[PDB]
Coordinates of C-alpha atoms in Angstrom, one line a residue:
Chain A
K1 CA 78.6 82.9 98.7
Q2 CA 82.4 82.0 97.7
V3 CA 82.6 81.7 93.7
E4 CA 85.7 81.2 91.6
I5 CA 86.0 82.7 88.2
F6 CA 88.7 81.6 85.4
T7 CA 89.2 83.7 82.7
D8 CA 91.6 83.8 79.6
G9 CA 91.3 85.9 76.2
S10 CA 93.5 86.1 73.2
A11 CA 93.5 87.1 69.5
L12 CA 95.1 85.1 66.7
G13 CA 96.5 88.2 65.0
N14 CA 97.5 91.5 66.0
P15 CA 94.7 92.4 65.4
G16 CA 92.9 89.6 64.1
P17 CA 90.2 87.1 64.9
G18 CA 89.9 86.7 68.8
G19 CA 88.2 85.3 71.5
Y20 CA 87.6 84.7 75.7
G21 CA 86.7 81.7 77.6
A22 CA 85.4 82.1 81.3
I23 CA 84.5 79.4 83.8
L24 CA 82.5 79.8 86.9
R25 CA 82.6 77.3 89.9
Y26 CA 80.3 77.3 92.8
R27 CA 79.7 74.8 95.3
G28 CA 81.2 71.9 93.2
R29 CA 79.0 73.2 89.9
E30 CA 80.3 74.9 86.9
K31 CA 79.4 76.9 84.0
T32 CA 81.4 77.9 80.7
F33 CA 81.0 80.8 78.7
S34 CA 83.0 81.6 75.4
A35 CA 82.9 84.0 72.4
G36 CA 84.4 84.9 69.4
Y37 CA 85.1 88.1 67.7
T38 CA 86.3 88.9 64.1
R39 CA 88.7 91.4 64.3
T40 CA 90.2 92.5 68.0
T41 CA 93.3 92.1 70.0
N42 CA 95.0 90.3 72.6
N43 CA 94.5 92.9 75.4
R44 CA 90.9 93.6 74.6
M45 CA 90.2 89.8 74.6
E46 CA 92.0 89.2 78.1
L47 CA 89.8 92.2 79.3
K48 CA 86.7 91.2 77.7
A49 CA 87.1 87.6 79.3
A50 CA 87.0 89.0 83.0
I51 CA 84.3 91.5 82.3
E52 CA 81.9 88.6 80.6
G53 CA 82.8 86.1 83.5
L54 CA 81.8 88.9 86.0
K55 CA 78.5 89.8 84.2
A56 CA 77.6 85.9 84.3
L57 CA 77.0 86.3 88.0
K58 CA 73.8 87.7 88.5
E59 CA 73.7 88.1 92.0
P60 CA 76.2 89.8 94.5
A61 CA 79.1 87.5 95.2
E62 CA 82.5 87.1 97.0
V63 CA 84.7 86.3 93.8
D64 CA 88.3 84.9 93.5
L65 CA 88.8 85.6 89.5
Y66 CA 92.1 83.9 88.2
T67 CA 93.6 84.8 85.1
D68 CA 97.2 84.9 83.6
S69 CA 96.6 88.4 81.8
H70 CA 99.8 90.3 81.8
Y71 CA 97.6 93.4 80.6
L72 CA 95.3 93.0 83.6
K73 CA 98.2 92.2 86.0
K74 CA 100.3 95.3 85.0
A75 CA 97.0 97.3 85.1
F76 CA 96.2 96.3 88.8
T77 CA 99.7 95.7 90.2
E78 CA 101.1 99.3 89.2
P79 CA 93.9 109.0 76.3
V80 CA 93.7 105.7 78.0
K81 CA 93.6 102.8 75.3
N82 CA 90.6 100.4 75.7
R83 CA 88.8 102.9 78.0
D84 CA 85.5 101.1 76.9
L85 CA 86.5 98.0 78.1
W86 CA 88.2 99.4 81.5
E87 CA 84.8 101.2 82.1
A88 CA 82.7 98.1 81.4
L89 CA 85.0 96.1 83.9
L90 CA 84.6 98.6 86.5
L91 CA 80.9 98.2 86.2
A92 CA 80.9 94.5 86.0
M93 CA 82.7 94.4 89.3
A94 CA 80.4 96.6 91.1
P95 CA 78.1 94.2 92.6
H96 CA 80.8 92.1 93.9
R97 CA 83.7 91.6 96.2
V98 CA 86.5 90.8 93.6
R99 CA 89.9 89.3 94.6
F100 CA 92.2 89.0 91.6
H101 CA 94.7 86.5 91.4
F102 CA 97.2 86.8 88.6
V103 CA 98.7 83.3 88.1
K104 CA 101.8 82.3 86.1
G105 CA 100.4 80.3 82.9
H106 CA 98.4 77.0 83.2
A107 CA 101.1 75.0 85.1
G108 CA 99.0 74.2 88.2
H109 CA 95.8 76.0 87.0
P110 CA 94.0 73.2 84.9
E111 CA 90.9 75.6 84.7
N112 CA 92.9 78.4 83.1
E113 CA 94.2 75.9 80.7
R114 CA 90.4 75.3 79.8
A115 CA 89.5 78.7 79.6
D116 CA 92.3 79.6 77.2
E117 CA 91.3 76.4 75.3
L118 CA 87.7 78.0 75.0
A119 CA 88.9 81.3 73.9
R120 CA 91.2 79.7 70.9
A121 CA 88.3 77.6 69.7
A122 CA 86.0 80.5 69.9
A123 CA 88.5 82.6 67.9
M124 CA 88.7 79.9 64.9
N125 CA 85.2 80.5 64.2
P126 CA 84.3 84.1 64.9
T127 CA 81.0 85.8 63.8
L128 CA 80.7 88.9 66.3
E129 CA 82.3 92.1 65.9
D130 CA 84.2 93.7 68.7
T131 CA 82.1 97.0 68.5
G132 CA 84.5 98.9 70.4
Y133 CA 87.9 98.1 68.7
Chain B
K1 CA 59.3 107.3 89.5
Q2 CA 63.0 106.3 88.4
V3 CA 63.5 106.1 84.9
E4 CA 66.7 105.4 82.7
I5 CA 67.2 106.9 79.4
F6 CA 70.1 105.9 76.9
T7 CA 70.5 108.1 74.0
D8 CA 72.8 108.3 71.0
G9 CA 72.8 110.6 67.8
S10 CA 74.8 110.7 64.9
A11 CA 75.6 111.8 61.4
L12 CA 77.5 110.6 58.3
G13 CA 79.1 113.9 57.5
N14 CA 79.3 117.4 58.4
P15 CA 76.8 117.9 57.6
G16 CA 75.1 114.7 56.3
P17 CA 72.2 112.3 56.8
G18 CA 72.0 111.7 60.5
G19 CA 69.6 110.3 63.3
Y20 CA 68.8 109.5 66.7
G21 CA 67.9 106.9 69.2
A22 CA 66.5 107.1 72.6
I23 CA 65.5 104.0 74.6
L24 CA 63.6 104.6 77.9
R25 CA 63.6 101.9 80.6
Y26 CA 61.0 102.1 83.5
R27 CA 60.1 99.5 86.2
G28 CA 59.8 96.7 83.6
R29 CA 58.6 98.8 80.5
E30 CA 60.8 100.0 77.6
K31 CA 59.9 102.7 74.9
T32 CA 62.1 103.5 71.8
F33 CA 62.2 106.6 69.9
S34 CA 64.3 107.1 66.5
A35 CA 63.9 109.6 63.6
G36 CA 66.1 110.5 60.7
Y37 CA 67.1 113.6 58.9
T38 CA 68.5 114.8 55.5
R39 CA 71.2 117.4 56.6
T40 CA 72.5 117.6 60.0
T41 CA 75.5 117.1 62.3
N42 CA 76.8 114.8 65.0
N43 CA 76.6 117.4 67.4
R44 CA 72.7 118.3 66.7
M45 CA 71.9 114.7 66.7
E46 CA 73.3 113.9 70.1
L47 CA 71.4 117.0 71.3
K48 CA 68.2 115.8 69.6
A49 CA 68.5 112.3 70.9
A50 CA 68.6 113.5 74.8
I51 CA 65.4 116.2 73.9
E52 CA 63.3 113.6 72.4
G53 CA 64.2 110.9 75.0
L54 CA 63.2 113.4 77.7
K55 CA 60.2 114.9 76.1
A56 CA 58.7 111.2 76.0
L57 CA 58.3 111.3 79.7
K58 CA 54.6 112.1 80.4
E59 CA 54.8 113.0 84.1
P60 CA 57.9 114.3 86.5
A61 CA 60.5 111.7 87.1
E62 CA 63.9 111.1 88.5
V63 CA 66.1 110.6 85.6
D64 CA 69.4 108.8 84.9
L65 CA 70.5 109.7 81.3
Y66 CA 73.5 107.8 79.8
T67 CA 75.0 109.3 76.4
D68 CA 78.4 109.2 75.1
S69 CA 78.0 113.0 73.6
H70 CA 81.6 114.8 74.1
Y71 CA 79.4 117.8 73.2
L72 CA 76.9 117.4 75.8
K73 CA 79.7 116.2 78.5
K74 CA 81.6 119.6 77.8
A75 CA 78.5 121.7 77.9
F76 CA 77.5 120.0 81.2
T77 CA 80.7 119.5 83.0
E78 CA 81.3 123.3 82.3
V79 CA 76.0 130.1 70.1
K80 CA 76.1 127.0 68.0
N81 CA 72.7 125.2 67.9
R82 CA 70.7 127.5 70.5
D83 CA 67.3 126.1 69.4
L84 CA 68.2 123.0 70.5
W85 CA 69.6 123.9 73.8
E86 CA 66.8 125.9 74.5
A87 CA 64.5 122.7 73.8
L88 CA 66.8 120.5 76.0
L89 CA 66.4 123.0 79.0
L90 CA 62.8 123.1 78.6
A91 CA 62.6 119.3 78.3
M92 CA 64.7 118.6 81.6
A93 CA 63.1 121.0 83.6
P94 CA 60.3 119.0 84.8
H95 CA 62.5 116.5 85.8
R96 CA 65.4 115.5 88.1
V97 CA 68.1 114.8 85.2
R98 CA 71.4 113.0 86.5
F99 CA 73.4 113.0 83.2
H100 CA 75.9 110.1 82.8
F101 CA 78.8 110.4 80.1
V102 CA 79.7 107.0 79.3
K103 CA 83.1 106.2 77.7
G104 CA 81.9 103.6 75.3
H105 CA 79.0 101.2 74.7
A106 CA 80.4 98.0 76.2
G107 CA 78.8 97.4 79.7
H108 CA 76.2 99.9 78.5
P109 CA 73.9 97.3 76.0
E110 CA 71.1 99.9 75.7
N111 CA 73.6 102.5 74.5
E112 CA 74.6 100.1 71.9
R113 CA 71.0 99.3 71.2
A114 CA 70.5 103.3 71.0
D115 CA 73.5 103.8 68.5
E116 CA 71.9 101.0 66.4
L117 CA 68.5 103.1 66.2
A118 CA 70.3 106.2 65.3
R119 CA 72.5 104.5 62.6
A120 CA 69.6 102.8 61.2
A121 CA 67.7 105.9 60.9
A122 CA 70.4 107.9 59.4
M123 CA 70.3 105.5 56.6
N124 CA 66.3 106.3 55.6
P125 CA 66.0 110.1 56.4
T126 CA 62.3 111.7 56.0
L127 CA 62.8 114.8 58.1
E128 CA 64.3 118.3 57.9
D129 CA 66.7 119.4 60.5
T130 CA 65.4 122.9 60.0
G131 CA 67.1 124.3 62.5
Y132 CA 70.8 123.1 61.5
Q133 CA 71.8 126.5 62.5
Chain C
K1 CA 94.3 113.5 119.4
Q2 CA 90.8 114.5 119.9
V3 CA 89.4 116.9 117.1
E4 CA 86.2 118.2 116.3
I5 CA 85.0 118.7 112.7
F6 CA 81.9 120.8 111.6
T7 CA 80.7 120.4 108.0
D8 CA 77.7 121.4 105.9
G9 CA 77.1 121.1 102.3
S10 CA 74.4 122.8 100.2
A11 CA 72.9 123.4 96.5
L12 CA 71.2 126.1 94.7
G13 CA 69.3 123.4 92.5
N14 CA 68.7 120.0 92.0
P15 CA 71.0 119.7 90.3
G16 CA 72.5 123.0 90.4
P17 CA 75.5 125.0 91.8
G18 CA 76.5 124.0 95.0
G19 CA 79.4 124.1 97.8
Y20 CA 80.7 122.9 101.1
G21 CA 82.4 124.3 104.4
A22 CA 84.3 122.5 106.7
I23 CA 86.1 123.5 110.1
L24 CA 88.5 121.7 112.1
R25 CA 89.3 122.5 115.8
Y26 CA 92.3 120.7 117.6
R27 CA 93.3 121.8 121.0
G28 CA 93.6 125.5 120.2
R29 CA 94.4 125.0 116.5
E30 CA 91.9 125.5 113.7
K31 CA 91.6 125.0 110.0
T32 CA 89.1 125.9 107.6
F33 CA 88.2 125.5 103.8
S34 CA 85.4 125.7 101.3
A35 CA 84.8 124.8 97.6
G36 CA 82.0 125.4 95.2
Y37 CA 80.7 123.1 92.4
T38 CA 79.4 124.0 89.3
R39 CA 76.8 121.0 89.0
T40 CA 76.0 119.0 91.7
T41 CA 73.1 118.0 94.4
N42 CA 72.5 118.9 98.0
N43 CA 73.3 115.3 99.0
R44 CA 76.5 115.1 97.4
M45 CA 77.7 118.6 98.7
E46 CA 76.5 117.2 102.2
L47 CA 78.8 113.9 101.7
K48 CA 81.7 115.9 100.0
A49 CA 81.8 118.1 103.1
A50 CA 82.4 115.2 105.5
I51 CA 84.7 113.6 103.3
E52 CA 87.0 116.8 102.8
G53 CA 86.8 117.7 106.4
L54 CA 88.1 114.3 107.4
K55 CA 90.7 114.0 104.7
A56 CA 92.5 117.1 106.2
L57 CA 93.5 114.9 109.1
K58 CA 97.0 114.1 108.8
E59 CA 97.1 111.2 111.4
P60 CA 94.7 108.8 113.1
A61 CA 92.4 110.8 115.5
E62 CA 89.2 110.3 117.8
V63 CA 86.7 112.5 115.8
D64 CA 83.4 114.1 116.6
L65 CA 81.8 115.3 113.5
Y66 CA 78.8 117.8 113.6
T67 CA 76.5 118.1 110.7
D68 CA 72.8 118.4 110.1
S69 CA 73.1 116.3 106.9
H70 CA 69.9 114.2 106.8
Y71 CA 71.4 112.2 104.0
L72 CA 74.3 111.0 106.5
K73 CA 71.9 110.9 109.4
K74 CA 69.5 108.2 107.5
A75 CA 72.4 106.4 106.3
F76 CA 74.1 106.1 109.7
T77 CA 71.1 105.8 111.9
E78 CA 70.3 103.0 109.8
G79 CA 73.5 101.4 108.7
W80 CA 73.0 101.7 105.0
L81 CA 76.7 101.4 104.3
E82 CA 76.6 97.7 105.7
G83 CA 73.2 97.2 104.2
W84 CA 74.5 98.0 100.9
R85 CA 77.7 96.4 100.6
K86 CA 75.8 93.2 101.7
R87 CA 73.5 93.5 98.4
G88 CA 76.3 94.4 96.1
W89 CA 75.2 98.2 96.2
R90 CA 72.2 97.8 94.4
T91 CA 68.8 99.2 95.1
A92 CA 65.5 97.2 95.7
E93 CA 65.1 97.5 91.9
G94 CA 68.7 96.1 90.9
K95 CA 69.7 99.7 89.9
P96 CA 73.3 100.8 91.5
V97 CA 72.9 103.0 94.7
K98 CA 73.4 106.6 93.8
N99 CA 76.7 108.4 94.9
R100 CA 78.7 105.2 95.6
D101 CA 81.5 107.1 94.6
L102 CA 81.2 109.7 97.3
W103 CA 80.1 106.9 99.9
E104 CA 83.0 105.0 99.1
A105 CA 85.2 108.1 99.5
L106 CA 83.6 108.5 102.9
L107 CA 84.4 105.1 104.3
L108 CA 87.9 105.6 103.1
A109 CA 88.1 108.8 104.7
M110 CA 86.7 107.7 108.2
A111 CA 88.6 104.3 108.3
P112 CA 91.9 105.5 109.9
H113 CA 89.7 107.3 112.7
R114 CA 87.5 106.5 115.7
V115 CA 84.4 108.7 114.1
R116 CA 81.5 109.8 116.1
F117 CA 78.5 111.9 114.2
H118 CA 76.5 114.4 115.6
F119 CA 73.4 115.1 113.5
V120 CA 72.7 118.6 115.0
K121 CA 69.4 119.9 115.1
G122 CA 70.0 123.6 114.8
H123 CA 72.9 126.1 114.4
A124 CA 72.6 127.2 118.0
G125 CA 75.0 126.2 120.6
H126 CA 77.5 125.1 118.0
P127 CA 78.8 128.4 116.3
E128 CA 81.0 126.6 114.1
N129 CA 78.0 124.9 112.3
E130 CA 76.6 128.6 111.3
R131 CA 80.0 129.3 110.2
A132 CA 80.1 126.0 108.1
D133 CA 76.9 126.9 106.7
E134 CA 78.0 130.2 105.9
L135 CA 80.9 128.9 104.2
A136 CA 78.9 126.2 102.1
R137 CA 76.3 128.7 100.8
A138 CA 79.1 131.4 99.9
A139 CA 80.8 128.5 98.0
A140 CA 77.7 127.8 95.9
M141 CA 77.4 131.2 94.8
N142 CA 80.9 131.2 93.3
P143 CA 81.5 127.6 92.0
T144 CA 85.1 127.0 90.9
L145 CA 85.3 123.3 90.5
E146 CA 83.4 120.3 88.8
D147 CA 82.0 117.4 90.8
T148 CA 83.5 114.7 88.5
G149 CA 81.7 111.8 90.3
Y150 CA 78.5 113.2 89.7
Chain D
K1 CA 116.5 86.0 126.2
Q2 CA 112.8 87.1 126.5
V3 CA 111.2 89.5 124.3
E4 CA 107.6 90.9 124.0
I5 CA 106.4 91.8 120.7
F6 CA 103.1 93.5 120.2
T7 CA 101.6 93.5 116.6
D8 CA 98.5 94.8 114.6
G9 CA 97.4 95.6 111.1
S10 CA 94.4 96.9 109.2
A11 CA 93.4 97.9 105.9
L12 CA 91.1 101.1 105.2
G13 CA 89.4 99.3 102.2
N14 CA 88.6 95.5 101.1
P15 CA 90.6 95.7 99.4
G16 CA 92.3 99.2 100.2
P17 CA 95.3 101.1 101.5
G18 CA 96.6 99.4 104.7
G19 CA 99.5 99.0 107.1
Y20 CA 100.9 97.1 110.0
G21 CA 102.6 98.1 113.3
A22 CA 105.1 96.2 115.4
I23 CA 106.5 97.1 118.7
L24 CA 109.4 95.0 120.3
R25 CA 110.0 95.4 123.8
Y26 CA 113.2 94.0 125.7
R27 CA 114.1 94.6 129.4
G28 CA 113.1 98.1 128.6
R29 CA 114.7 99.1 125.1
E30 CA 112.0 99.5 122.5
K31 CA 112.0 99.2 118.8
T32 CA 108.9 99.5 116.7
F33 CA 108.1 99.0 112.9
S34 CA 105.4 100.1 110.4
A35 CA 104.9 100.3 107.0
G36 CA 101.9 101.1 104.5
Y37 CA 100.5 99.4 101.4
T38 CA 98.5 100.6 98.6
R39 CA 96.3 97.7 98.0
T40 CA 95.7 94.9 100.4
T41 CA 93.3 93.4 103.1
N42 CA 92.9 93.4 106.8
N43 CA 94.0 89.8 107.3
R44 CA 97.0 90.5 105.1
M45 CA 98.1 93.1 107.2
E46 CA 97.4 91.4 110.6
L47 CA 99.6 88.5 109.2
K48 CA 102.1 90.7 107.9
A49 CA 102.3 92.5 111.3
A50 CA 103.4 89.2 113.0
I51 CA 105.7 88.3 110.3
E52 CA 107.6 91.7 110.5
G53 CA 107.6 91.9 114.3
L54 CA 109.4 88.7 114.3
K55 CA 111.7 89.6 111.6
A56 CA 112.9 92.4 113.6
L57 CA 114.7 90.0 116.1
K58 CA 118.3 89.4 115.1
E59 CA 119.2 86.3 117.1
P60 CA 117.1 83.2 118.6
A61 CA 114.9 84.3 121.4
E62 CA 111.9 83.4 123.6
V63 CA 109.0 85.5 122.2
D64 CA 105.5 86.4 123.7
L65 CA 103.8 88.1 120.9
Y66 CA 100.5 89.7 121.5
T67 CA 98.0 90.2 118.9
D68 CA 94.2 90.9 118.7
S69 CA 93.9 89.3 115.3
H70 CA 90.8 86.9 114.9
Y71 CA 92.5 85.7 111.6
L72 CA 95.5 84.7 113.7
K73 CA 93.9 83.4 116.6
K74 CA 91.6 81.1 114.3
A75 CA 94.5 79.7 112.4
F76 CA 96.7 78.9 115.5
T77 CA 94.1 77.7 117.7
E78 CA 92.9 75.1 115.2
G79 CA 95.9 74.2 113.8
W80 CA 95.4 75.2 110.5
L81 CA 99.2 75.6 109.7
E82 CA 99.7 71.9 110.7
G83 CA 96.7 71.0 108.9
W84 CA 98.1 73.2 101.4
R85 CA 94.6 72.9 99.9
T86 CA 91.2 74.0 101.6
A87 CA 88.9 70.9 102.4
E88 CA 87.4 71.2 98.9
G89 CA 90.7 71.1 97.3
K90 CA 90.9 75.0 96.8
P91 CA 93.9 77.1 97.0
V92 CA 94.7 78.2 100.8
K93 CA 94.7 82.1 100.8
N94 CA 97.4 84.3 101.7
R95 CA 99.5 81.1 101.6
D96 CA 102.4 83.2 100.7
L97 CA 102.3 85.1 104.1
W98 CA 101.6 82.0 106.0
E99 CA 104.6 80.5 104.6
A100 CA 106.5 83.9 105.7
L101 CA 105.1 83.4 109.1
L102 CA 106.5 80.1 109.6
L103 CA 109.8 81.3 108.5
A104 CA 110.1 84.1 110.6
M105 CA 108.9 82.0 113.5
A106 CA 111.4 79.1 113.1
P107 CA 114.5 80.7 115.1
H108 CA 112.3 81.5 118.0
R109 CA 110.3 79.8 120.9
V110 CA 107.2 81.8 120.1
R111 CA 104.3 82.0 122.5
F112 CA 101.4 83.6 121.0
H113 CA 98.9 85.6 123.2
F114 CA 95.5 86.3 121.4
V115 CA 94.0 89.4 123.1
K116 CA 90.2 90.4 122.7
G117 CA 90.9 94.3 122.0
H118 CA 92.9 97.2 123.3
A119 CA 91.7 97.4 126.4
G120 CA 94.0 96.6 129.1
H121 CA 96.8 96.0 126.2
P122 CA 98.4 99.5 125.8
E123 CA 101.1 98.3 123.7
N124 CA 98.6 96.7 121.2
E125 CA 96.8 100.0 121.3
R126 CA 99.9 101.8 120.0
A127 CA 100.6 99.4 117.3
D128 CA 97.1 99.8 116.0
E129 CA 97.7 103.5 115.8
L130 CA 101.2 102.9 114.0
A131 CA 99.4 100.7 111.4
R132 CA 96.6 103.0 111.0
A133 CA 98.9 106.1 110.4
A134 CA 101.2 104.1 107.8
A135 CA 98.0 103.1 106.0
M136 CA 97.5 106.9 105.7
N137 CA 100.4 107.3 103.2
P138 CA 100.9 103.9 101.4
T139 CA 103.7 103.3 98.8
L140 CA 104.5 99.8 98.8
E141 CA 102.9 97.0 96.9
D142 CA 101.5 94.0 98.7
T143 CA 102.7 91.8 96.0
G144 CA 101.2 88.6 97.1
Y145 CA 97.8 90.0 97.1
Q146 CA 95.4 86.7 98.6

C-alpha cells in the first residue's frame, strides 16, 4: 500500500495561464495527470497539483508526496488566501496517510522535473477556468 | 437512509433575477432541482435552495447538507425573510439535518454543479419570489 | 500519577443545544468544569466530555475514565478507531465517518496517557457520574459556545 | 569509562506532536534530556532519542544503550545501515536521522540492548514518561520530517 506521488504546478503569468502535473507510482507502475487553466496563480497551481494527485488515488493508501512547492512547504512547516483549495486539500488527504516531502528543486528528483514539464505544457494550451480564482 | 444534499442560491443584483440549484444524492440515485425568480436576493435564494432540497425528501432521512451560504452559516452557528426561515424549519423537522458550511466549490464538485444550476436558472426567471420581504 | 475522570455529555435535540461535564479526582485533589453548546448532538457531547476531561491533564498519567456513553462503548469494545483508520475513515458506503474531528481529538488527548474506560451501567455507586450528568444537562440549558466541528 | 544510556521516544499522532527522553547514568550521577516536536512520527522520535542521548556524552566512552524501539532493533539486527536506496531504488526514509545516529555513535564504543518493553527496565519506563511529557508541550519543528 506504498504509493508515491510527485506534483508540481505553476502559472506563466501572475496571474496568467497555469497548469499542474501529477505523477503516481505504485509497484513499478505509473499514471500521469495534467490540466491547464486560463487564469490562475503559482500558489493555486502548486496546491491544485497536490489536491488532484491525491484525488487520483481511489482507495485509502499510505502516501509519500514529493513537491518543490515553497507555498506548501511554508504552510506545512510553520481571511486566509485560497481557502477554497486548502479545504479541498484537507478533504483530498482525508482517506490517506500522507507524508509530505518538500524537495529542493529537480536536482535528484526526475519525477518532479517531469511533473513540472507536464504543468508547463498544460499551461501553454489551457481551456479550463480556475473557478475559485 | 443517509442522504447528501448540495445547495446553492444566487442573484444578479440586490434585488435582481436569481435562482437556486439543489442536488440530492442517495445510494446511487441523484435528483436535481432548480428554479429562477424575476426579482430576489442572494440571501433568499440561498435559503430557498436548502428549503427545496429538503422538501424533495419523501420520507425521514439522515441528511448532510453542504452549502456555502454565509447567511445560513451565521444563522446556524449563532426579521429579514421570515417566510423562508419558517419554511426551512418546517422542511428540516422530519429529518436529522447536519449542515456543512463549505469554504469553496473545489473539492465540492456537487456544489459547483448546484451553483451552475442556480446561475442558469437566474438567466431565465419565470417565477415570482412574492415573499421578497 | 493515578487519576479518575468522570464525564458525561447530552443534548436536547438532534441536533440541538447540548453540554458536557467533567470531574477529575487525583489523590485528594479535584477539578470540575462544564460547557454548553448552541447546536450539537448527544454523541458529539459524549465524545467532547471525554476529550476535555483528558485535556485537563497536565502530565502523563494512568487514567480510569468513567462514562455511560454508548457511542464510546461501542467504538472501544469493537475497536472502531483502528477499523476506521485502516479504511481511510470511510463508511461502508464510501462516505466520510461522522465526527472524525472529535475522534481524532480524543485519540490525541488519550495518547500521552494509559487510559482505561469504565462504561458504567448507572449513576449509583459512582456519585461523580451523577454530578457530571447534572453539570452536562445544566450546560445544555445554558449554551455559551459553538460546536465548531459539527 | 562505561556509561549507561536509556532512550525512548513517541509521537501522539502519525504524524502528530512527539517527544524523546534520554537518561544517562555513570557510576551514579544522572542526567536526563527531553524535547518536544510539533509534527513528527514515532519512528523519528525513537531515533532522535538515541541520537540525543549519545550527543549528550562529552568524551569518548564505552556505551550500553537500552531502548525498546522496534524500528532501531530491526535496523541494527538486519544490518540496514551497513546495507542509501531501498531495494526498489526508492529513498530510504528518515535518512537524515540515520546519518545523525551514525555520527553520534562514531566517537564511542556503542553496545545496543534492544529490550522488549518497560517491565524490568525502570530507566526505560522513566525515559518513556519524559518523552510523553515533552510531547504534551511541543515547540520545536522536526525539520527533517521522513
